[PDB]
Design a protein around this ligand. Structure first.
Ligand SMILES: [W+6]
Ligand SMILES: [W+6]
Ligand SMILES: [W+6]
Ligand SMILES: [W+6]
Ligand SMILES: [W+6]
Ligand SMILES: [W+6]
Ligand SMILES: [W+6]
Ligand SMILES: [W+6]
Ligand SMILES: [W+6]
Ligand SMILES: [W+6]
Ligand SMILES: [W+6]
Ligand SMILES: [Zn+2]
Ligand SMILES: [Zn+2]
Ligand SMILES: [Zn+2]
Ligand SMILES: [Zn+2]
Ligand SMILES: [Zn+2]
Lengths: 269, 269, 254, 256, 250
DNA sequence: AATGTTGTCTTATGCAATACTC
DNA sequence: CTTCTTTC
DNA sequence: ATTGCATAAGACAACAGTGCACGAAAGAAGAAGACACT
DNA sequence: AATGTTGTCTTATGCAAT
DNA sequence: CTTCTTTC
DNA sequence: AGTGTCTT
């Protein structure tokens, strides 16, 4: 049956259940036949990726431009968020230039303070010599991303949800439909980012401004296990941050801290 | 604090968790406040009951065109599947014409038999008076689809993902990567259709041939309950088909048969 | 330390106390650096005032707001003095700091108008007026006016702008000034205006909880440090021993 | 560990990270050791900085030709008696023999760099050359620090072996060599990798295992091999061109 | 590719594997290029055993001293003028700066390496020394370095137009082309460059092959969700196999 | 060089407190 | 006899 | 008595005729001529 | 007039031999 | 001193 | 005045 099944899959590439039933082969073997085939293994998962987040506020920032035509003429919205505090700062601009990046960054620093590093995309206004000189002056490390995959920029584009879903609702509330009047744009914006920092975020236990100015940093965390490349669970780690998607775990022997998917962490003892 | 919370949401449109905590209101009330707001319409009521299925073999067919450049210059693949037996029939054509549709349906009839009804999407070939007058002589019911949002012919469009992949796997297996030579295209077709229809489809207990020529039609099914618009569970129904996604259920008092989502059916007693 | 402080003052013109503390410089030296330059409870009561600024044209009028205890400062540029401008500046102020209790203004028309009046009722803020420019209500707001009217001028001259700041860089001047004032120390106190406002600290541990122990009882004396999927890690306050328990077995203590 | 670290610093005056790693000593101790002693950017092999310095302690061969890799911090120095068009080409030749053939080299406008002979030497090797004043910050500023590094290591080494103001000739070429081994093979500073490991890729992986990558249209394309596979990203090389690109983990799956 | 390969061999006389990889040419052509030119127990560890001997080439008139690593295949030559026991200390001094500190250096017992100055010099570096008891396995290694340096300098100098001798101003300069040709670019039919074996995995593992047998000789490089990438130690071919088909080797 | 995000949306259980049906 | 339009 | 097994979970995935069309912003690449070197 | 669908895909659970 | 390649 | 890197 094993050779007959191999020949059958060679010619027809029959799935494993059919070969297992037809030739009376156990499922592990039939699956082994599909696995050993080069063309039929065209769907392995091989998925991973952590945003990542910072262990404390004013450490990791993310910034990107988004287009909200309601703010016309200055329809470009530069959005920035701290990964630890989840607090949002936004300004309006008419053109996406490095001047707008250093201006917006100047405002966000004027509100929340100076961050350790800002994580942007591969845009031309962020990769300009002038921007590198600006962050060279303010001492902020620069981290770009994949060319076209904003998944790593997730928790800033996630902000672009609120900033665009809150501006819609608040603008419709004051009776503005096609374009927000220029006299009330500042009020709209101020109330907008006012509602998203001093007040909780749905099921969030604290407010983003409280998580900003009064963050929770564990000195030494509780012990956890992590699932390592071979699929095994390894003791000897402690967790410092455990969020919804991902957790930050620290190795006990070195104090190195890494971010891993939640599914790959379980309590140690 | 019902009015205080309402005012807070009026101005800032604060979520229910925040208003419930801030104004000490129970959950149901705060949620009612968010619900009662028009510009915060959640909504999210989109009726999920959606069922494109038929009862018996040769009763309801699905037919659509798709592009696979491996068969060029005749790369146009016409696909027709029987919704009850899941038996696929595909024919290659250089250009999508009503004559090509009548040729395809002529072959699928020459293999499976004359169907009672065929459901397609409203294209140029199907909505022509010529194809209409062709189904006229053969007595086959014609059912078009929504202009653009083709999610109902899915069990044929999904068939393309079942089809074209089995093409590639058979093409790469024979050393043909870019375009399959004209001499072996038809053999590729026959080998694909024989691999799909004459063997189990993954977890399928019967083969499409065993499901077509030896189908299983229940004289009368076991009793079930269905969840009705008000959310209640109503007795007095019997289930005739219970698949992975959807179920066909029959009303005991009238013998009227309707299709409903699996999640909306449970055993009666 | 002397060069770092000099560079810092060149760009932001930070006062001597802040540079002395930040760069570990003795008082006399840091002060000498500031000298060599030629152009050199919280959230209870606020103070608002308008001031002229022809260099910030077209939006020349600047609205300034300051807190009494935290010494914070928020500014907004406007093209003319209107009620919507006052409400905009106040919405930005409460956006950066939060909704206060009382705000002290003057007897001006923009602050005594109707559109400004009814805006106080919805947001719930108290107002106080009196003599047109008295010494107890209009004192510190003028100090802030000196703060901003000096900072914008000196920084704008420091980046190469002399007569009129271009329309693009104006907001950047705003942000740089507010950064030089909020986050930096203009007084002998080691606490910045930002520090004196939010009282920034770090949660060394979690809030107190009770945990259900093997016998089913609920025991006080624990704080929770981690709440993961399914289980929670809780720490005993008297010993710092940490154990993992099911989420269902934890509830807030008091 | 305390004696091993003391001997290592005595001879080479190795920085604290290297001594901490070599003898398994914590950071506070290594830093105390450095204290107790009195005398104490994308891809590599792309841009070099070359300049001359005059160490009077290396006389009569006082002129030192220094070339440091910008993306590796690894340096190559050779002694010369006079700065001419031949000494520069010999130094560049030795450096190329040590750390591989680069593509660009940044120097100043000296006569030894603008001569026709050296120009032809640049042309025959297919290497780029640019001028300068010098005195910039982004470029032309790394070699300046490298010169102080080299003169400092030579000074601390020769003065460590009993030579004060002039190094004996019969030992000159040695007191230079012992410097480079301390500035290339061992880690100098506070980083993790060694300046030699901070050089070339390292050991540019001729072949990786086969992968597919998801291309703009959503398709999965064969013909790539992965050279680096990190948590977020993988480095994959096209087999037909040797072009290497970085892509998200979710867009890669095993081939075959 | 034809011009790139021809130019590369003209200047450096690079072997066929290196030219094939560098210019993406199939092996038959590169071998034809090598043809067209007229003058044209080894797995312990790198940086452990060195062979050093003196062999004279008259083209560098008025000596040469070689030092080769027995694993990385790299070579270092200093071209001394007078053969003394000091030239050995300076030669090894220049070698341990490029190839690093070796764990041992073995030389055939001569009147030059057995001196007390050389022995104290060995002890000063913590490097063990053993006079060669020069072996038959090294007969094809250190002499290989000798004649490979001689022939490489001969072909480079002849290609430059210098028949008998080389100008002393160009002598120290052409030393680099030889080491660069014999160290960076690959030589012979080998796969790894002499550099790629000095600065460079599995547990190892065994893999279950199509016939069901378990084969030793593989190391695993990637273990993802479901599948593993394993590398054959001999050919360096890498294949992906199911997790169930891999187990630790020893 | 540099990784997917949470803010909500409905319905499904487990336990106090009216309002009923004997 | 062109365009013009609705679908795939 | 533990471990080989054919079943769960519990998702990923892509079918929809084809995808590349354009703009902005900042930098890189190619090209015609002026002052210095040859 | 005319309803998002399944075949794989990985890693966790119940019946019988060394 | 214009016209391409990159990315958002 | 070749021609050549440097200017724009
Ligand atoms: W034809
Ligand atoms: W033909
Ligand atoms: W034909
Ligand atoms: W004026
Ligand atoms: W004036
Ligand atoms: W004035
Ligand atoms: W004036
Ligand atoms: W003025
Ligand atoms: W003026
Ligand atoms: W004036
Ligand atoms: W003036
Ligand atoms: Zn197959
Ligand atoms: Zn609302
Ligand atoms: Zn100043
Ligand atoms: Zn020292
Ligand atoms: Zn040759």
């Amino acid at each position: 049956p094993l050779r007959e099944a191999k020949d059958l899959h060679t010619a027809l590439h029959i799935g494993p259940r059919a070969l297992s039933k037809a030739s009376n082969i156990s499922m592990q073997q039939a699956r082994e036949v599909v696995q050993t085939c080069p063309h039929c293994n065209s769907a392995p998962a091989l998925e991973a990726g952590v945003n990542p987040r910072g262990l404390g506020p004013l450490q990791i920032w993310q910034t990107d431009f988004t287009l909200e035509p309601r703010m016309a003429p200055r329809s470009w919205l530069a959005v920035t968020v701290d990964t630890a505090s989840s607090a949002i700062v936004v300004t309006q601009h008419g053109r996406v230039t490095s001047v707008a990046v250093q201006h917006h960054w100047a405002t966000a620093i004027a509100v929340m303070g100076r961050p350790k590093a800002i994580k942007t995309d591969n845009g031309s206004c962020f990769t300009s010599k002038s921007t590198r000189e600006w962050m060279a002056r303010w001492g902020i490390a620069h981290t770009t991303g994949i060319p076209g995959n904003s998944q790593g920029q997730a928790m800033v584009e996630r902000a672009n949800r609120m900033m665009k879903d809150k501006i819609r609702v608040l603008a419709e509330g004051d009776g503005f439909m096609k374009r927000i009047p220029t006299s009330k744009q500042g009020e709209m914006m101020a109330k907008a980012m006012y509602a998203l920092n001093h007040f909780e975020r749905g099921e969030n236990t604290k407010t983003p401004i409280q998580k900003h100015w009064r963050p929770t940093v564990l000195t030494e965390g509780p012990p956890v296990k992590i699932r390592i490349e071979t699929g095994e669970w390894e003791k000897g780690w402690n967790v410092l941050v455990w969020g919804r998607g991902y957790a930050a775990v620290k190795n006990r022997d070195t104090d190195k801290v890494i971010w891993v998917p939640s599914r790959k962490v379980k309590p140690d003892i």
